[PDB]
């Protein structure tokens, strides 16, 4: 079971825990999935989410996009830019306690927080271009809703490693902390937010985000062929 | 007499001082539209508007809204963003002098100046989710013209305050000074871009804002249906 | 000979140097297209591009701009810009070593480097509005797309000059060195960045700036007729 819920009073907090790297997987996505079904139940005034000591997370499992079986890797992308999307435009604040680096879909993933506490030493990294990788168009819009003009081209075509007080200025994070008060401190940023006026927070949210969540949700329903553009793109 | 207007050479300086909040009223309106047509009649080379020595604004006033009369609530937030769009494509520089808070339609005020100056204690806020409202769509187009990508995102979903240094980052002032220094501060600031190109600077002005002008234009038009948007939403 | 071209293992090395200010004219133009033609053929990992020890470049010929004959000033005109988006959809990293002010065309020059380094004391500057002018659409498009919103505001409308970290923070420029620095520091970053995958960079270049080249190759082709509403518009 790579992830915990666990109702505080006003708000609920979900941890990431695999053993590792906090992939985000089929299996991790559904962990996720229900467990923010489960704050969705218990209609909490705030949620928190954390990685666990190492990672907020490596992004997605590298090995089912290398193994050259496509149907299940379009489904893992899709569901990561589904989850991130979900996050993006829930109705209640939504808090990440970034607890280590935050990788590729780990850093789209942070981007959809209302509110985003790390410490100084975290690397939160767009790595595709680094590793051979082009970046989809979802998380490009993620990226672009967030990153400054100028950190969202450096995150971007060149894989611009950012950290503590870069990433504050770059608009990757909200707020730097110390490693140890970093759930503390999204736990109580969550209660202050909860404070705010949910309705009034979850139309406002949406109106902010509006043009991007569009192009997100076509993000999503481009992927499959985003990926057979560039299979043939190579081809040639 | 809520409004002071005075020549001084090459500008004019237009100060609010109503009794207490610099509200937005229709009476406070009317007065600085009257004062912004004083400065057209003496084609002065920049503008600087100042509040007093509590606040530049509280916003609008709050029991307009809240008294249930609808008619007369539209007007003013219509003649509220009117002003808006007024000074942001005033052919002349226009220097916010930021004398205390400014507060949702005192931000939004706040924001359409070419360059704004204000101290390190003033808070400004858009509080409208703080106090259960979301942020009418015009407000949206003066904050997202100014803020950065992330800022954008806090000041409005989670009603962010902001101060001083975390302003200036943020997209919110231009430039920081002591206390019985803004006022001063912006008035230099006013001459020296009074000897800048009136029509070039004019012109500039209005390329450097055309969509943001246009979807404000559309934000005054749309207010009165915004807000029955609202109505009836509820009522569901 | 206004330009030189250099190899040096995975990079290259373009460097202007007039007898002065680096002016833009169509000489300038020519040497540089030349200077990237080489690049083009010896398909270097990353490009460097420089001034001389006095400026990156002060931009335009103001002269032929002075002069009333129309046709070669739109032939510099769109021949800046065309180099400018040259290098803005470059498909290897472009690095900006800035050796000194850049004002104008020369800020807009810099603006299309994908890492752009300076020292504190240059000035970047579009001083259009200032000396007259109303910058063109295609300027605005570059630093649209660097600037942070209120920066942008302020570097169009009022001339602002920036310097070092304002110019940092504004998004003018990506990294501060010292003087004696700039260069050297310039090619490090252009062989870390040929390290990065070519075609994955390549790509992700043009997806993180889709639009504003959109937006930019209108700007060349209007320029022309741009001019010409500015002409018949002062006429009345």
Redo the contacts between chains.
Sequence with gaps: DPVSYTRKDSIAVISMDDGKVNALGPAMQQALNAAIDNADRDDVGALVITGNGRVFSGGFDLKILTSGEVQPAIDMLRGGFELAYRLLSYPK?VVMACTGHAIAMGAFLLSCG??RVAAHAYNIQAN????????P?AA?EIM???????????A????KTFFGETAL?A?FI?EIALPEVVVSRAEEAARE?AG??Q???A???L???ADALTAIRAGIDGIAAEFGLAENLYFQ
Tied chains: 1, 2, 3.
């Design positions: 604040p209302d509110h595709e271009v680094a590793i051979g990788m082009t970046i168009y490009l672009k809703l967030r990153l400054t003009r100028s950190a969202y081209q450096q971007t075509g060149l894989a200025a608009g909200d937010f705010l006026n309705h009034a927070h139309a406002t949210k109106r902010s985000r």
